[PDB]
C-alpha cells in the first residue's frame, strides 16, 4: 500500500548508484524520531547495497531530482515486527518525507 504524493515538483535513479537526500520522519502522533535537516549532515546510501529499509528504497526509486514527496511506507516493509529499541514502536507505520537532492 505504498503511495507517493508529489510536493512541489524526469531523472530516475540508476541501479547501484548513490543518491544524497535530506529526509524527515513523522509518526501519526507527531513526534520526530529522526531529522536529517536538524543534524545538518547529508545522508548517503546505495540502492544495490540493500543497507536501507525496503520502503525508503522503493520510495526513492520513484522520486526525481530536486523534488520532495511524502513517501508513505507500509508497516511490513519497514520495521515489521521490531525496529530500533526505543525509537520505533512495534506494529506502527513510518512516513518519510524524502527530498531527493542527488547529483
Numbering used by the authors: 1 to 9, 13 to 106
Wording from the paper:
Ryanodine receptors (RyR) are >2-MDa membrane proteins that allow for the release of Ca2+ from the ER and SR, thus mediating a range of Ca2+-dependent processes. Each forms homotetrameric assemblies of ~5000 residue long subunits. Mutations in RyR1, the skeletal muscle isoform, can cause malignant hyperthermia (MH), central core disease (CCD), and other myopathies. Here, a collection of cryoEM structures provides insights into the molecular consequences of MHrelated RyR mutation R615C, and how apoCaM opens RyR1.
With the expected functionality of the R615C mutation confirmed, we solved cryo-EM structures of wild-type and R615C pRyR1, under nominally Ca2+-free conditions (5 mM EGTA), in the presence of FKBP12.6, which was used as a bait protein for purification. Despite identical experimental conditions, the overall R615C pRyR1 resolution is lower than for WT, potentially indicating a larger inherent heterogeneity. Superposing the N-terminal solenoid (Nsol) shows that loss of interactions mediated by Arg615 leads to pivoting movements of the neighboring solenoid regions (Bsol, Jsol) relative to Nsol. Locally, this results in shifts ~2–3 Å in the Bsol region near residue Glu2175, but due to the pivoting movement this is amplified further away from the mutation site, e.g., up to ~10 Å in the Bsol region around residue 2457. The N-terminal disease hot spot domains (NTD-A and NTD-B), located around the central 4-fold symmetry axis, are no longer forming inter-subunit interactions with the N-terminal domains of neighboring subunits, as observed for WT RyR1. The overall result is a widening of the cytosolic cap, with the corner regions moving downward toward the SR membrane. Corresponding movements in the Jsol region cause a splaying of the C-terminal region, which is directly linked to the S6 inner helices of the pore domain. As a result, the pore is considerably widened, consistent with an open channel based on the position of the S6 helices. However, for R615C pRyR1, the main conformation of the Bsol region without apoCaM bound is different from either of the two conformations with apoCaM. Instead, it can be best described as a conformation that is ‘intermediate’ between the two when considering the degree of bending of the Bsol region.
